[PDB]
């Protein structure tokens, strides 16, 4: 469980994310694909993009990163009261896209790296631990949901 001040730190840096959701999404996507290329194999629509600039230029990748970050922000603003928001994301990612919890750890790393690379002044050691606990909770809860749907990833 997170404290109230932990959630405040989480939402305080997310308000900075929401100034440019599309650019944060591009960066987190591209950091995901570069740090762990097997993850790009899950995107039939994006695994033809070969260089960084092709990813940056893809309107279709940009839109999708806004979609990703919008759903995550909605989860974070529920401060752990996210079953309603999390179940659809569990359904699709367990039974359709088939995303193991490691891929979720990979993107949590990407998120924390981009957050630090755009907002150091606002993402020091407490904010960074608070965001870390929030994403840990998301990964724990969504793993329990994966299991409920019969997916062991």
Positions touching ligand HEM (CB under 6 A) are 39, 42-43, 45, 64, 67-68, 71-72, 89, 92-93, 97, 99, 103-104, 107
Least Å distance between CB 66 and Mg ion? 11
Return the number of the residue (35 or 92) whose C-beta is nearest ligand HEM: 92
Return the number of the residue (121 or 153) whose C-beta is nearest ligand HEM: 153
Q: Count residues contacting Mg ion (CB under 5 A)?
A: 1
Backbone torsions φ then ψ of 124, nearest 5 degrees: -80, -165
Which segment (55-63, 67-75, 77-85, 140-148) binds Mg ion by CB under 5 A?
67-75
Cα within 13 Å of Cα(4), Cβ side: 0
Structure tokens at 83: 């079953």
CA distance 68 to 72: 6
Backbone torsions φ then ψ of 56, nearest 5 degrees: -60, -35
């Amino acid at each position: 469980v997170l404290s109230e001040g932990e959630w405040q730190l989480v939402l305080h840096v997310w308000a900075k994310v929401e100034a440019d959701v599309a650019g944060h999404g591009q960066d987190i996507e591209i950091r995901l694909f570069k740090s762990h290329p097997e993850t790009l194999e899950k995107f039939d629509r994006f695994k033809h993009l070969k260089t960084e600039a092709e990813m940056k230029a893809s309107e279709d990748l940009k839109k999708h990163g806004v979609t990703v970050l919008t759903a995550l922000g909605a989860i974070l603003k529920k401060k752990g009261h996210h079953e309603a928001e999390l179940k659809p994301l569990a359904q699709s990612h367990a039974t359709k896209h088939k995303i193991p919890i490691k891929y979720l750890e990979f993107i949590s790393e990407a998120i924390i790296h981009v957050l630090h690379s755009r907002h150091p002044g606002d993402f020091g050691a407490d904010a960074q631990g608070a965001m870390n606990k929030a994403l840990e909770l998301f990964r724990k809860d969504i793993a329990a949901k994966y299991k409920e749907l019969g997916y062991q990833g």
